[PDB]
Write an enzyme that holds these catalytic residues in place. Sequence first.
Site, PDB file in Angstrom:
ATOM      1  CG  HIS A 267      -0.264  -0.196   2.727  1.00  0.00           C
ATOM      2  ND1 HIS A 267      -0.212   0.962   3.270  1.00  0.00           N
ATOM      3  CD2 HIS A 267      -0.128  -1.285   3.540  1.00  0.00           C
ATOM      4  CE1 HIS A 267      -0.162   0.568   4.445  1.00  0.00           C
ATOM      5  NE2 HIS A 267       0.196  -0.433   4.571  1.00  0.00           N
TER       6      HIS A 267
ATOM      7  CG  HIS B 188       3.811   6.109   5.336  1.00  0.00           C
ATOM      8  ND1 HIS B 188       3.885   5.795   6.195  1.00  0.00           N
ATOM      9  CD2 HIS B 188       2.911   7.099   4.687  1.00  0.00           C
ATOM     10  CE1 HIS B 188       2.935   6.985   7.371  1.00  0.00           C
ATOM     11  NE2 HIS B 188       2.835   6.495   5.952  1.00  0.00           N
TER      12      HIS B 188
ATOM     13  CG  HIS C 116      -0.810   8.517   2.417  1.00  0.00           C
ATOM     14  ND1 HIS C 116      -1.617   7.651   2.702  1.00  0.00           N
ATOM     15  CD2 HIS C 116       0.249   8.836   3.309  1.00  0.00           C
ATOM     16  CE1 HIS C 116      -1.314   7.291   3.485  1.00  0.00           C
ATOM     17  NE2 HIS C 116      -0.382   7.556   4.723  1.00  0.00           N
TER      18      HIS C 116
ATOM     19  CD  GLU D  99      -3.529  10.058   3.519  1.00  0.00           C
ATOM     20  OE1 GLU D  99      -3.484   9.353   5.135  1.00  0.00           O
ATOM     21  OE2 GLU D  99      -4.158   8.819   2.688  1.00  0.00           O
TER      22      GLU D  99
ATOM     23  CG  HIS E   3       1.639  10.096   7.021  1.00  0.00           C
ATOM     24  ND1 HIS E   3       0.273   9.842   6.085  1.00  0.00           N
ATOM     25  CD2 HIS E   3       0.638  12.346   6.278  1.00  0.00           C
ATOM     26  CE1 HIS E   3      -0.186  10.318   6.102  1.00  0.00           C
ATOM     27  NE2 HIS E   3      -0.034  11.716   6.477  1.00  0.00           N
TER      28      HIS E   3
ATOM     29  CB  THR F  29      -4.543   7.988   7.225  1.00  0.00           C
ATOM     30  OG1 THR F  29      -3.336   7.406   6.900  1.00  0.00           O
ATOM     31  CG2 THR F  29      -5.065   9.034   7.631  1.00  0.00           C
TER      32      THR F  29
END
Length: 258
Positions: free
Chosen positions: A62, A92, A94, A104, A117, A196
């Site tokens: 992911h 990491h 997103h 996010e 993050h 999240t």
Amino acid sequence: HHWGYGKHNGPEHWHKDFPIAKGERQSPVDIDTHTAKYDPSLKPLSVSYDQATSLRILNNGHAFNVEFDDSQDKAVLKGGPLDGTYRLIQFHFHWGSLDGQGSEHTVDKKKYAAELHLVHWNTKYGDFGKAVQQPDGLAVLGIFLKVGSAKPGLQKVVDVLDSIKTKGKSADFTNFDPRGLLPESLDYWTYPGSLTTPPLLECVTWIVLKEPISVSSEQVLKFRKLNFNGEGEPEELMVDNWRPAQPLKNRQIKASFK
Ligand SMILES: C[C@]12CC[C@@H]3c4ccc(OS(N)(=O)=O)cc4CC[C@H]3[C@@H]1CCC2=O
Ligand SMILES: [Zn+2]
């Protein structure tokens, strides 16, 4: 049929396996900059990454996680809204399929190209696994990415991604300095929220920096070459691994700055 980001297993499905998905302190949220109240009681954030020791980078199916040795009190976040000391364990990102989405958190509904993050656990709970069972167990420092100038301190991460293309691949990743990913200003917004991704635990003090970092189009294009799938499976590009903004409910977003 595990969770992911697709039509059949994406964020709008997560509540079936993880009912806390519809809980009272879910993340991310839209940050309405006009409603966020300046809190003069908030302290400057203390980010002490001089002794941070990275070990490994992992494609977990992911995202990719840059993991740190948290066996000693080295890389710590404190101050800001926090009580006590939180130890860095991983960072990491997103990101989107396009530059126009990927973050996010949103700021007055603005979506950034990506969001970093840095995940820290509260040392009073002894380890990462016990901390996520507590409402003040984690502090996650969120940093927006916009596309423009390259971030030189990100290139060592971008260049290792070829070696972890698919789910379950890891690579040695020592001596990476996360200070090279921080903007100039530590001005922030803060609110109580959650992980999240599943298991969506309500254990996070969110600290979201106001100042984005700039990364180049080429840097974020290399994030988009990663794969959600394992080696020898149908290729699914790792893109749009962001959860949309969730209801703020009975929460206040506080600003560190006027
Ligand atoms: C709960 C967790 C620790 C936290 C892990 C986590 C942390 C941050 C995270 O992303 S975010 N965006 O909330 O910072 C996702 C996850 C999913 C796996 C989670 C792990 C599964 C088992 C365990 O001990
Ligand atoms: Zn995250």
